[PDB]
Amino acid sequence: TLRNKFNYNTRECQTINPSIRERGVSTEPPPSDTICGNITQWEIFDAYY
Amino acid sequence: SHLDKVQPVIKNSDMSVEMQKEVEEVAKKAIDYCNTDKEIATFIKDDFRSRYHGTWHCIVGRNFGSFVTFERSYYIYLYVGQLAILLFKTG
Structure with missing residues (x-):
């Protein structure tokens, strides 16, 4: 009462x-390509010429 | 007797004496196997990449110079006759 x-x-x-909330994030860096270059005195001059 | 004649010389070798000795043989084996300078660079990289993994960059020639950022204790600079085999791994 x-x-x-x-x-x-x-x-x-x-x-x-x-x-x-459960989420996935995979970060993969830019692809990395092998390059092979040779330089000789003539090939420089040939372009230069 | 050509392997005794070349006698590869190592100006700067920031690497362990065991890994250095391996480079001398590969360096000699590369030149006597290869027909041109472009092929020498290709053979060295591919042989080391297999042995020790990662991202190698190999340069060889008559006259050049080299300021580079490398994985510490993975840089050797040896000249043989008039060919400077320069290999270095980066992260």
Whole structure:
């Protein structure tokens, strides 16, 4: 009889929680290509000429 | 007797004495196997890449110079006759 509706209100309260989510990310660097160049005095000059 | 004549010389070798000795043989074997300078560079890289893995860069010629960033204790600079075999691994 002492515990009333206007002597003990009863509130509900929660916090806003973001939904958990599981994702994959694979980072692969730019491809690396072998190059073979030869330089001789003539091949320089041939272009130069 | 040509292997005794070439007598490959090592100016700068920032590498262990065991791995150095291996390079001398490969360096000699490369030249007597190969018909041109472009083939020498190709044979050295491919042989080392198989033995020790990673990203080698090999350069050889008459007259050049070389400032480079390399994996510490993976750089040798040997000249034989007039050919400087320069190989270096990078990360």
